[PDB]
Structure 1
Amino acid sequence: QIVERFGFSEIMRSTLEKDNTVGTDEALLDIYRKLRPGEPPTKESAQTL
């Protein structure tokens, strides 16, 4: 759906290609570990905040 929405521009294609991690429960924990460091990253602990 990301390619469906941002397909008319090549910069967004390059963004999704150069991306490091993929997954709904993966980028969420990435945001958790970059936002509140030093805490155990649970899928729901990040889904909450």
Structure 2
Amino acid sequence: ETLRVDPTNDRLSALVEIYRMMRPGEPPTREAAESLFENLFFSEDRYDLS
């Protein structure tokens, strides 16, 4: 059901909508979106679960 409500398709459009929820109104430069998501959960320095 989840897949149906989500009109977005590829990795990139997902990263776009991700970025557009986090920074609504900032133009979706590709590398900016990728860097955002990556740094959100996979940044060593930002993210430590301990």
Secondary structure at the aligned position of 2:7 is classed as coil
RMSD: 1.2
Structure 2 segments unaligned to the other structure (5+ residues)? 37-50
Asked if residue 44 in structure 1 is aligned to residue 49 in structure 2, the reply is no
What TM-score do the two structures reach when normalised by structure 1? Answer: 0.59
In the alignment, structure 1 residue 30 sits paired with structure 2 residue 17? yes
Q: Over alpha carbons, which structure has the higher Rg? A: 1
Which residue is 2:3 aligned to?
A: 16
Aligned structure 1 segments of 4 or more residues deviating by more than 6 angstroms: none
Number of positions where the alignment pairs a residue of Structure 1 with one of Structure 2? 36
**Identical columns (%):** 53
SS of equivalent to 2:26: coil
In the alignment, the residues of structure 2 paired with residue 32 and residue 41 of structure 1 have an alpha-carbon distance, to the nearest angstrom, of 7
Q: Once the 2 structures are TM-superposed, how far is the Cα of residue 17 of structure 1 from its aligned partner?
A: 2.7
